[PDB]
Amino acid sequence: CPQNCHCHSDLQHVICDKVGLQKIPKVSEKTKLLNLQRNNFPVLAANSFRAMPNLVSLHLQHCQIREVAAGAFRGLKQLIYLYLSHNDIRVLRAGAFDDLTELTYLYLDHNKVTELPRGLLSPLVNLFILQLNNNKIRELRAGAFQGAKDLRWLYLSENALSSLQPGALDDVENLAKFHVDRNQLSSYPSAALSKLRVVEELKLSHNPLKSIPDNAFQSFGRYLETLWLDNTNLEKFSDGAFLGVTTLKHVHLENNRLNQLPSNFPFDSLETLALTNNPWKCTCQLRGLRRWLEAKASRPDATCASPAKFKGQHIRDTDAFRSC
Amino acid sequence: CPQNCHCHSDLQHVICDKVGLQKIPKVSEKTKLLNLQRNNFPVLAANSFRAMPNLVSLHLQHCQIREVAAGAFRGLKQLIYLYLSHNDIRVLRAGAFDDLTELTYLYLDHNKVTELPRGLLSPLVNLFILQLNNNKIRELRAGAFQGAKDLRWLYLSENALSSLQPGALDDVENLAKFHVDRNQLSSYPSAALSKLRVVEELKLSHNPLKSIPDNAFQSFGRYLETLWLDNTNLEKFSDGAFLGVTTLKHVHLENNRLNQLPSNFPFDSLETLALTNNPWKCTCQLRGLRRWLEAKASRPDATCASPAKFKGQHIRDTDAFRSC
Ligand SMILES: [Cl-]
């Protein structure tokens, strides 16, 4: 057990949490968990973890890491978790994650990554979660996810994405969750998202999308269960926007400029619907929404904005749908 | 495997990181790690983790926990790690940690705890680390740590401690690290610290201590290796302050009002000494400091403030020690 660090006998855990380390310590070959959080490792040179074959979890958060050389993790074939959150990584070089065959969860959030280059994830064949929230990624170029066949949860919230290349998501067609909220997408990325086939959660909050085009959800219409479009400056849903959507259960439309919903809005499977803070127009087009709201026990405070006669009245209680 | 969460088969890990849970999920009885971070559990009632005998690690950070009822963790006999950081817990009454016999690491930092009552840690007989940084603790009453015989690392930085009752530390005489920096200690707590026998790191930065009395380090003089007294408004060391100190290696005195060092200042084992920003008076008292500075490499230096003739001169270069 290294100095300044503490070790649990039975568990083969090494704890070096904020113990002032400047170098990667030497540890037993059977070490299964190595916690090096809150230290100082500005550079992770190649073979930084040489004699650690049995390592299953490696925690390197808050280590002020600025450089990750190619092959830094070269010896860690049995590694399952890798936490690199809250460092100063600006570039992820190809080869950085070499020999991480069994890696399943990779956390790179709260760094300064600006790009995902081709082949970075090539050897990460078992990667299930890729956590990249709170970086500065501006564009996902083609090949960014080549090799990551097992990837299912992809988090890219709070970056600077202004567009998604049509080929950005070709290699991860089997994503289950895709979060790209709080970016700068100025329109619904039809080309990129049309490659996803089995998305269950799509999170697009806080992107000035303005509108949703036709066939937006076709490619994953029978898998999509949760949809976030809150604070997207949403003015309109295309009449064919929801073509092919059959199992949508939770939808967030709060804080937009929506006056109407399309005739084919899928209320059949809908379970929850956040829709407050919209200038709802209480006329006949909204009859679909009324019937659904009357059916549900939660009482949202979604009032009418127009026409003038019903302004202020709740959509659920108002008598504006008597003629329709 | 609960809904919205992912489970690793071989490791018996359950990951529910920010998946929107409102209640503690049900999991397999052999589950060894349960990650429930970034959820919302305002109340942890008794027996919240009933059928989890083999649970070894439990993560509840950022869960907006405001209340921990007695017996919340009643079934977790094999628990080793417990993370409760970054919640809104204001009170920890006795019984909160019942049946946590094997608990070794307890993180309660970044909450709003105001006091440590008697018997709170009674069943935590294997507790090694107790993290209470960034709370609002004002006073440690006698009995606060009764039962915590294995406790070695105690963090209390960033609280509101204005005094330590003489009996505060009786039960934890074997502390290795004691951090109480950034509090409101208006003087060196002689009575409380005199009970510690083997302290290796004592961290008192950012406390208006004003002075250090005689025998301040007597009871643990043969173990103290690192001492932080920076930003303590320190005017002087008592002539007997360093009685019994035999292995002091690292000392921080930066940002104080020190003009002199005591004759018995222990330079024998000293390796590092931060001493910048002090009104050093370069006369006969500082010769011990001069010789030590001359001996050390790349360990910069602080300038003289008096006498007037040597204002501005570095202690390492000055010629004020020729008549020694
Ligand atoms: Cl100075």
What is the per-residue DSSP string for A125-169? TT--EEE--SS---EE-TTTTTT-TT--EEE--SS---EE-TTTT
CA of B275 to the centre of ligand 1 (A): 9
Report yes or no: A109 and A134 within 8 Å, Cβ to Cβ: yes
The shortest CB-CB distance from A80 to any of B8, B128, B129 is to: B8
Residues 6+ apart with CB under 8 A from B141: B115, B116, B117, B118, B165, B167, B168
CA of B272 to the centre of ligand 1 (A): 18
Residue B243 gets which letter from DSSP? Answer: T
CA of A3 to the centre of ligand 1 (A): 34
Does domain A1-324 correspond to CATH entry 3.80.10.10? yes
Question: How far is it, in rounded angstroms, from Cα A123 to Cα B91?
Answer: 48
**Neighboring chain A residues of B8 at a CB cutoff of 8 Å:** 80, 104
**Neighboring chain B residues of A129 at a CB cutoff of 8 Å:** 6, 15
Report yes or no: B69 and B93 within 8 Å, Cβ to Cβ: no
Question: How far is it, in rounded angstroms, from Cα A324 to Cα B75?
Answer: 58
Q: What is the resolution of this structure in A?
A: 2.1
Residue B99 gets which letter from DSSP? Answer: T
With H, G, I as helix, E, B as strand and everything else as coil, classify residue B103. Answer: coil
Cross-strand partners of B252: B228, B274
> Of A13, A79, A175, A177, which to mutate for an interface test with B (greatest number of B Cβ within 10 Å)?
A13
**Which class for B146: exposed (0-12), middle (13-18), buried (19 or more C-beta within 10 A)?**
middle
Question: How far is it, in rounded angstroms, from Cα B316 to Cα B300?
Answer: 8
What residue spans define the domains of chain B?
Answer: 1-324
A191: closest CA of chain B, how far (Å) = 28
C-alpha distances in Å from residue B253, one per residue of B33, B203, B304:
43, 11, 15
CA of B208 to the centre of ligand 1 (A): 20
Phi, psi (deg, nearest 5) at residue B295:
-75, -25
B80: closest CA of chain A, how far (Å) = 9
Determination technique for this PDB entry?
Answer: X-ray
DSSP string, A56-67: -EEE-TTS---E
Q: Chain A residue with minimal CA distance to B200?
A: A4
| Encoded tokens for A239 | 């009449």
| Encoded tokens for B304 | 């003289």
Residue A176 gets which letter from DSSP? Answer: S
Q: Chain A residue with minimal CA distance to B201?
A: A4
A8: closest CA of chain B, how far (Å) = 9
A129·B6 Cβ contact <8 A: yes
B6·A128 Cβ contact <8 A: yes
Question: How far is it, in rounded angstroms, from Cα A276 to Cα A301?
Answer: 6
CA of B313 to the centre of ligand 1 (A): 10
**Neighboring chain A residues of B153 at a CB cutoff of 8 Å:** 6
**Which class for A153: exposed (0-12), middle (13-18), buried (19 or more C-beta within 10 A)?**
buried
Residue A52 gets which letter from DSSP? Answer: -
Residues 6+ apart with CB under 8 A from A193: A164, A169, A199, A202, A216, A219
Cross-strand partners of B314: B303
Residues 6+ apart with CB under 8 A from B11: A56, A80, B32, B33
**Neighboring chain B residues of A105 at a CB cutoff of 8 Å:** 15
Q: What is the dihedral of CA A238, A239, A241, A243, to 10 degrees?
A: -170
Going by C-alpha positions, the residue among B147, B88, B89 that lies closest to residue B123 is B147
DSSP string, A231-292: TS---EE-TTTTTT-----EEE--SS------TT---SS--EEE--SS--B-SGGGHHHHHH
Going by C-alpha positions, the residue among B256, B254, B198, B260 that lies closest to residue B223 is B198
CA of B321 to the centre of ligand 1 (A): 19
Q: Chain B residue with minimal CA distance to A176?
A: B4
B11·A56 Cβ contact <8 A: yes
Question: How far is it, in rounded angstroms, from Cα B254 to Cα B235?
Answer: 12
Report yes or no: A298 and A274 within 8 Å, Cβ to Cβ: no
Q: Is the dihedral of CA B227, B230, B233, B235 positive or negative?
A: positive
Residues 6+ apart with CB under 8 A from A204: A180, A181, A185, A188, A227, A228, A229, A232
**Neighboring chain A residues of B128 at a CB cutoff of 8 Å:** 6
> Of B104, B130, B134, B151, which to mutate for an interface test with A (greatest number of A Cβ within 10 Å)?
B104
A104·B128 Cβ contact <8 A: no
Question: How far is it, in rounded angstroms, from Cα B111 to Cα B131?
Answer: 11
**Neighboring chain A residues of B105 at a CB cutoff of 8 Å:** 15
| Residues of A at the B interface, defined by Cβ within 8 angstroms | 6, 8, 11, 15, 56, 80, 104-105, 128-129, 153
Helical (H) or strand (E) element with B190: helix B190-193
| Residues of B at the A interface, defined by Cβ within 8 angstroms | 6, 8, 11, 15, 56, 80, 104-105, 128-129, 152-153
A105·B11 Cβ contact <8 A: no
| Encoded tokens for A138 | 């501006």
**Neighboring chain A residues of B56 at a CB cutoff of 8 Å:** 11
Going by C-alpha positions, the residue among B234, B240, B186, B184 that lies closest to residue B217 is B240
Report yes or no: A38 and A14 within 8 Å, Cβ to Cβ: no
Say which residue the tokens 């302050």 belong to: B241
Angle at B73 between CA B72 and CA B79, to 5 degrees: 165
Helical (H) or strand (E) element with A187: none
Residues 6+ apart with CB under 8 A from A311: A303, A304, A305
The shortest CB-CB distance from A8 to any of B6, B11, B80 is to: B80
B105·A15 Cβ contact <8 A: yes
**Which class for A105: exposed (0-12), middle (13-18), buried (19 or more C-beta within 10 A)?**
buried
Q: Chain B residue with minimal CA distance to A5?
A: B153
